[PDB]
Amino acid sequence: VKSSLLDNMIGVGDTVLLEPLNEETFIDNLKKRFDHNEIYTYIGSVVISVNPYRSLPIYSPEKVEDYRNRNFYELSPHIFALSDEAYRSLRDQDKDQCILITGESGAGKTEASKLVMSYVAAVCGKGAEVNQVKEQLLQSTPVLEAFGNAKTVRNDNSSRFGKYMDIEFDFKGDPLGGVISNYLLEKSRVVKQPRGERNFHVFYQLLSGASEELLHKLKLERDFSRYNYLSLDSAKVNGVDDAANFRTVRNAMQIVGFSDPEAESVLEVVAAVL
Amino acid sequence: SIKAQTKVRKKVMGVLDIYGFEIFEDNSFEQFIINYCNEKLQQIFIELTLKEEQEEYIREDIEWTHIDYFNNAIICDLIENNTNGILAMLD
Amino acid sequence: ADQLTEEQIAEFKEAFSLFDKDGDGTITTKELGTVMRSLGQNPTEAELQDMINEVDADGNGTIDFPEFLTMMARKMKDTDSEEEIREAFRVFDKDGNGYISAAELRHVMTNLGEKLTDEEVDEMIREADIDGDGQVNYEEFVQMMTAK
Amino acid sequence: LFPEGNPAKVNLKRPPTAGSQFKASVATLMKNLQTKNPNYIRCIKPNDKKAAHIFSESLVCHQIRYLGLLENVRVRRAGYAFRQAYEPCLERYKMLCKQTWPHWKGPARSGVEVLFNELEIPVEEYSFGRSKIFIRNPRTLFQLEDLRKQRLEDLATLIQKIYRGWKCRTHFLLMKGLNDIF
Ligand SMILES: Nc1ncnc2c1ncn2[C@@H]1O[C@H](COP(=O)(O)OP(=O)(O)O)[C@@H](O)[C@H]1O
Ligand SMILES: [Mg+2]
């Protein structure tokens, strides 16, 4: 079976018709649908995604094919119906579609982007050519986490640039490729960290998860208090630990295509700016 | 590595992983640029989506002009103006 | 207004005498719809039990041949159409490419309606093996159903 | 990294500082969005302690206040919540009228009008357009998809009993054929 707004309504799925309307009857709605673990909540063509901070199981390929060609008003509110509506307007209307994922840091924008793009490469129906495109984008995600995201006081993995992952189809529906594009990389975080934050954590990965010969040839030192670019009062962060995340990122760089002199050169430039 | 080789007229589906309003207790130049590109981002909602609603709604013969919207061109004019902006006086 | 011709009543007598493996001149209530859907009127189960409960207020389990002529004379005007069937499979085709998915067709034929068993939908997928696997040409399938 | 350091590349301009750089990057982003259709995700965290159960009210009310959601609800209550063209709407929804199902009923917009006049839909609920059919309310499509699902249950019962009829016809032709017809 399925969760349906038709029979046995749960809260309201779309909040546009929710009356009485204030801040309190809307936070009560999000608390109520967060109680029943239905995190997605429409405002029509706009999808609210509350972070469950745990594996909600409704992301299976049976959910993918289950939501394929389903409108906004047949199913429960879920991101695959908006992603599938934009795939319908891409495929049938033959015009470009984009999905703008906003919200606070640590709310799960990057994860929701991975789930959107995973759905898009799933319901395209051309699963042989689009798989390595999606896989290099997803395996390039933690790299850009390391080089582009840092720990603000609120989050621990705060998004500090505008990531933008494309998937590129022919008008006959043939996947050509995909172009990833940065926007608004915060440059001044490299040189100053405001008293509760830390730098882009590839410096902590390079000074923590790296071998001693790699510390020697990059001329670095493991003490965090040596470097002016590098805070000590906010260096240690739990959860996302200054740990073997470095070899996760470097292995991901091996997945994307970086050779060992190439990634060695990249880490050497990171040691030069450090 | 993944490039549209033999480039033709193509169509794109995109995903923008962009922040939300980084409103911190001690804001700085960075959160200023963050809130600013949020202002341009709401301008690309209020321009694209609301004005295609309006050309659609009026074009399909229904008699509306919906009530009001707070346009963000005043805030863009506050920041990105080449003479009276905030970024221009920083330049 | 005959309402039934003589050769057609001869076909009712031939089918009623052929299906009767008991040899007692009557059949049960649970196999009357086997005869009526073998002749090809396609009634429902609830209307059939409504007519059995109408002609039998005690649950005898015996079906008479003039009662069968009365029921088939009542079901004479109930004529379906191939086009409503075809548009129905067009509705269940969520894609519009003419090839309805066999797993989704199995989900409709098992999980919606009167909830058929594994063996009949197994015969349906085995019949759609000539169009399968994974895709079912419903346009050929409705002409293979409604040919005779 | 630096082609500007070529002495054969005389780039004499002063360095753009950060309003030029970040503002030009925003203008590049707006160049890569105005050619496309946007569809939004508004993403909400309940608390900063990464908890899967704890739903702090004040932080989410902070985010509702600054993601602009009540203003979004106000704008989306303008007139509508749903829009479509005529022909896939009549093709998808023609089962709810006795006249349009299964065929056809011409013309397209007129049979659409019969479809809305069949289910006793109020005139305030729908609206007629020139090339598109239009619905104000979400609960209207909740009712239309509810009656559609109730129609498809009867239609699935119809298809399952016609498949039983073709099955019993197949057993009847097999039983007739296996009786040594001379
Ligand atoms: N939809 C989700 N389901 C489960 N966990 C999630 C989800 N979204 C975010 N998370 C959790 O958030 C963490 C990272 O979130 P992220 O996507 O980086 O947030 P943001 O994009 O706002 O920085 C992950 O470790 C994951 O456990
Ligand atoms: Mg992120």
> Domain with C10 in it: what CATH number?
1.10.238.10
Alpha carbons D152 and A182: distance in angstroms, whole number: 48
Which ligand lies nearest the alpha carbon of A115?
1
Cα separation, A201 vs B74, in Å, equals 37
Question: Is position A271 annotated in a ligand binding site?
Answer: no
Alpha-carbon distances of C136 from C85, C101, C118, rounded to whole Å = 15, 6, 18
Taking the CA atoms of chain C, what radius of gyration do you get in angstroms?
Answer: 18
| Lining residues, ligand 1, CB within 6 Å | A 51-53, 105-112, 157, 159
**Sign of the Cα pseudo-torsion (C81, C82, C85, C91, in order):** negative
Per-residue DSSP letters for C34-82?
A: HHHHHHT----HHHHHHHHHHH-SS----B-HHHHHHHHHHTSS----H
* Residue of chain D whose alpha carbon sits nearest to that of C124: D163
How far apart CA C19 and CA C27 sit, in angstroms, is 8
Contact A235, A224 (CB under 8 A): yes
Nearest Cα to Cα of residue D145 among D91, D93, D85, D82:
D93
Q: Is A110 annotated as a binding residue?
A: yes
Cβ within 8 Å, pair D39-A82? yes
Three-state DSSP at B2 gives coil
Q: Kindly give, in sequence order, each residue whose CB lies less than 8 Å from that of residue C1, ignoring residues fewer than 6 positions away.
A: none
d(CA C31, CA C36): 9
Q: Are A139 and D77 contacting, i.e. CB atoms less than 8 angstroms apart?
A: no
Check: CB of residue A176 under 8 Å from CB of residue A183. no
Angle at A71 between CA A66 and CA A77, to 5 degrees: 75
Residue in B with minimal Cα distance to A95: B11
Beta strands in D6-95 (DSSP E): 37-44, 82-85
Measured in angstroms, how far is the CA atom of residue A101 from the centroid of ligand 1?
13
CA dihedral C107, C108, C111, C115 (to 10 degrees): -130
Burial D81-104 (b: 16+ CB within 10 A, else e): bbbbebeebbbebbbbbeebbbee
How many CA atoms lie less than 13 Å away from C36 in the CB half-sphere?
31
CB B85 within 8 A of CB B79: yes
Residue given tokens 């208090």 in the structure block:
A225
**Contact assignment for C120 to D166 by CB distance below 8 Å:** no
Residue A268 known to bind ligand = no
- Two tokens at A216? 């020697």
For chain D, breaks with the C atom over 2.5 A from the next N come after none
**Chain mean position to CA B54:** 17
Burial class (CB in 10 A: 0-12, 13-18, 19+), C7: exposed
With contact defined as beta carbons under 8 Å apart, do D77 and A16 qualify? Answer: yes
b/e code A211-226 from CB counts within 10 Å (16+ = b):
eeebeeebebeeebee
Looking up tokens 């749960």 gives A10
Q: In Å, what is the CA distance from A85 to each residue of A97, A204, D33?
A: 10, 41, 18
For this entry, resolution in Å reads: 3.2
Q: What pairs with residue D43 in β-bridges?
A: A49, A103
The half-sphere exposure of A50 on its side-chain side, counting CA atoms within 13 A, is 30
d(CA D35, CA D53) in angstroms, rounded, equals: 41
Parallel/antiparallel/unpaired status of strands A46-50 and D37-44: parallel
Contact A117 B16 (CB under 8 A): no
Range of the domain at C56: 6-75
User: Which chains neighbour C (Cβ–Cβ under 8 Å, 3 or more pairs)?
Assistant: A, D
CA pair distance D178, D180, nearest whole angstrom: 6
Angle at the Cα of C90 from the Cα atoms of C86 and C96, rounded to 5 degrees? 140
CB contact under 8 A, D69 and A6: no
Query: Do A177 and A133 form a contact (C-beta atoms < 8 A)?
Result: yes
Q: SS3 for chain A, per residue?
A: CCCCCCCCCCCCCECCCCCCCCCHHHHHHHHHHHHCCCCEEECCCEEEEECCCCCCCCCCHHHHHHCCCCCCCCCCCCHHHHHHHHHHHHHCCCCCEEEEEEECCCCCHHHHHHHHHHHHHHCCCCCCCHHHHHHHHHHHHHHHHHHHEECCCCCCCEECCCEEEEEEEECCCCEEECCECCCCCCCCCCCCCCCCCCCECHHHHHHHCCCHHHHHHCCCCCCCCCCCCCCCCCCCCCCCCCCCHHHHHHHHHHHHCCCHHHHHHHHHHHHHHC
Residues of chain A neighbouring D18 (CB-CB closer than 8 A): 187-188
Q: Are the beta carbons of A87 and A24 closer than 8 angstroms?
A: no
Q: Terminal CA-to-CA distance of chain C, rounded, Å?
A: 25
**What's the number of CA atoms in the CB half-sphere (13 Å) around residue A180?**
20
Q: At what angle do helices A109-122 and A79-91 cross, to 10 degrees?
A: 50
Q: Which helix (H) or strand (E) holds C136?
A: strand C135-137
Q: Which residues are CB-neighbours of A270 under 8 A, at least 6 positions away?
A: A202, A203, A206
Contact yes or no for D26 and B48 at CB 8 A: no
Compare all CA atoms of chain A with the CA of D147 and give the residue at the minimum distance.
Answer: A6
C35 forms beta bridges with none
Q: Which ligand is nearest to the CA of A163?
A: 2
- In this complex, the chains that touch A, judged by 3 or more CB pairs closer than 8 A, are B, C, D
B touches A, CB cut-off 8 Å, minimum 3 pairs: yes
Of the candidates A151, A153, A147, the residue with the CA atom closest to the CA atom of residue A274: A147
What are the structure tokens assigned to A33, written together?
Answer: 């649908």
- Helical pair D57-67 and D69-76, crossing angle rounded to 10 deg: 50
DSSP B36-91: HHHHHHHHHIIIIIHHHHHHHHHHTT-----S----SHHHHHHHS-TTT-HHHHH-
Edge-first strand order for the sheet with A175-177 is A40-42, A46-50, D37-44, A97-103, B10-17, A163-170, A175-177
Chains touching B by CB (3 or more pairs below 8 Å): A, D
Q: Do residues A96 and D36 make contact, with C-beta atoms less than 8 angstroms apart?
A: yes
What element of type H or E holds B10? strand B10-17
Instruction: Give A53's contacts in chain D (Cβ within 8 Å).
Output: 46, 50-52
Q: Tell me the C-alpha distance between A202 and A274, whole Å.
A: 10
Nearest CA in chain D to A54: D52
Cβ–Cβ gap B16/A101 under 8 Å: yes
On whether the CB atoms of residues A49 and A108 are closer than 8 A, the answer is: yes
Residue A97 forms contact with B (CB below 8 Å): yes
CB–CB contact B64 D78 (8 Å): yes
CA-based nearest distance A107→chain D, Å: 4
Alpha-carbon distances of A188 from A182, A229, A272, D44, D57, rounded to whole Å: 16, 10, 16, 27, 33
| Beta carbons within 8 Å of C139's beta carbon, 6+ residues apart | C86, C89, C98
D interface toward B at CB cutoff 8 Å?
Answer: 17-20, 22-23, 26, 29-30, 32-34, 36-38, 40, 43, 63, 66-68, 71, 75, 78-79, 83, 127, 129-132, 134
Q: Give dist(CA C128, CA D162) in Å, integer.
A: 16
Ordered strands of the D126-128 beta sheet: D82-85, D132-135, D126-128
Cα–Cα nearest to D100, from D85, D116, D84, D83: D116
Whether residue A165 contacts residue B15, with contact meaning beta carbons closer than 8 Å, is answered with yes
Measured from the Cα of A104, ligand 1's closest atom is 22
- Is A141 annotated as contributing to ligand binding? no
Tell me if D51 sits within 8 A of A56, measured CB to CB.
no
Q: Are C123 and C145 in contact (CB under 8 A)?
A: no
Exposure of C134 by Cβ count < 10 A (0-12 exposed, 13-18 middle, 19+ buried)?
Answer: exposed
Q: Cα separation of C90 and D13, whole Å? A: 66
B58 shares contact with chain D (CB less than 8 Å): no
Own/partner pairs for A259-265, CB < 8 Å, 24+ apart? none
The annotation status of A148 as a binding-site residue, yes or no, is no
User: How far, in Å, from the CA of D86 to the mean position of ligand 1?
Assistant: 41
A171 at interface of D, judged by CB pairs closer than 8 A: no
Q: Which amino acid is at C148?
A: K
* C104 within 8 A of C48, measured Cβ to Cβ: no
